[PDB]
């Protein structure tokens, strides 16, 4: 119907929102995984530089791996949220014709619903760091700073990290707190009186647990890690030959990737995700579902 028209504007709103939130994601990762402070400790050459390098090994890989997961999560979660609320706004708009109808999603409901995003940027992020840090530790912990990896050996290390992460809890758990949680930690100022918000959060949870969401997120994640690998390729060059670098040389390269992964200047990375046709098709199914009676 007249939906595709409302759907098209709603998509760019979602894009504005991602770009708008990346500084916040980046800043949180960089404060919680502050490698630049460890490199500053090494610049004023200290005694325990070995100890600091083994730290930086973990932090650099954790930061970049979390950067990729959380950025892909931000994109797909916002596509869900914005298309759920958009669909409700559409129906509220269609119900102004009718009489004895009240609006379901007024501005204060929209805003409380959308604030659920704070979990991903907040405690979910922190728990993701914890889980990924544990994986990097397992995979790279006992690997000498002297060990060489080609670009593709590095790719393989990243896959071993991913397999450890994607098989204690489902990924849905970092985007949304568990239902057995006080309502208050799930949206800003959320209480049992916020019936409509609670209902939107239920339907969001349905979406996040559905297999179609699993598919879209997996596709986004594969792309993200591919693109991360592509951004690093030039540093495994010298002129068309590729080299295996020792791990200590790979650390600074991995470390710098957050600036591309979480780039509001839509790095080719984020715009990459925002233009994936798979993501766009998923969004349209979400919107068709929530905008029909």
């Amino acid at each position: 119907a007249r939906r595709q028209y409302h759907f098209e504007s709603n998509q760019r709103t979602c894009n504005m929102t991602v770009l708008s939130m990346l500084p916040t994601l980046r800043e949180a990762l960089m404060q919680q995984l502050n490698s630049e402070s460890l490199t500053a400790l090494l610049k004023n050459r200290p005694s325990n530089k070995l100890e600091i390098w083994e730290d930086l090994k973990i932090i650099s890989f954790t930061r970049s791996t979390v950067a990729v997961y959380s950025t892909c999560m931000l994109v797909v979660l916002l596509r869900v949220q914005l298309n759920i609320i958009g669909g409700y706004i559409y129906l509220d708009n269609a119900a102004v014709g009718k009489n004895g109808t009240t609006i379901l999603a007024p501005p204060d409901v929209q805003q409380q619903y959308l604030s659920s995003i704070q979990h991903l940027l907040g405690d979910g992020l922190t728990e993701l760091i914890t889980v990924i840090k544990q994986a990097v530790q397992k995979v790279l912990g006992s690997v000498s700073l002297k060990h060489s990896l080609s670009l593709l050996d590095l790719e393989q290390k990243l896959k071993e990290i991913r397999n450890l992460v994607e098989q204690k809890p489902l990924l849905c758990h970092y985007m949304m707190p568990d239902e057995e949680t006080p309502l208050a930690v799930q949206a800003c100022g959320l209480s049992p009186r916020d019936i409509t918000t609670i209902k939107l959060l239920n339907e969001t949870r349905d979406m996040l647990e559905s297999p179609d969401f699993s598919t879209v997120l997996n596709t986004c994640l594969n792309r993200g890690f591919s693109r991360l690998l592509d951004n690093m390729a030039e540093f495994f060059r010298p002129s068309l030959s590729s080299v295996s670098l020792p791990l200590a040389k790979i650390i600074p390269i991995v470390n710098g990737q957050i600036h591309s992964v979480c780039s509001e200047t839509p790095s080719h990375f984020v715009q990459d995700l925002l233009t994936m046709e798979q993501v766009k098709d998923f969004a349209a199914n979400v919107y068709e579902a929530f905008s029909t009676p």
């Binding site: 090494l42 002297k146 540093f235 200590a248 600074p252 710098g256 600036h259 790095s267």
Partner: peptide, 26 residues
């Protein structure tokens, strides 16, 4: 051991070399 030392001091220079670019039409 001592190959280590020159590797760690060399790697340190690579943090600045790894960051992204700036742009002219802004």
């Amino acid at each position: 051991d001592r190959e280590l030392e020159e590797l760690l001091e060399s790697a340190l220079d690579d943090f600045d070399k790894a960051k992204p670019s700036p742009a002219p039409p802004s």
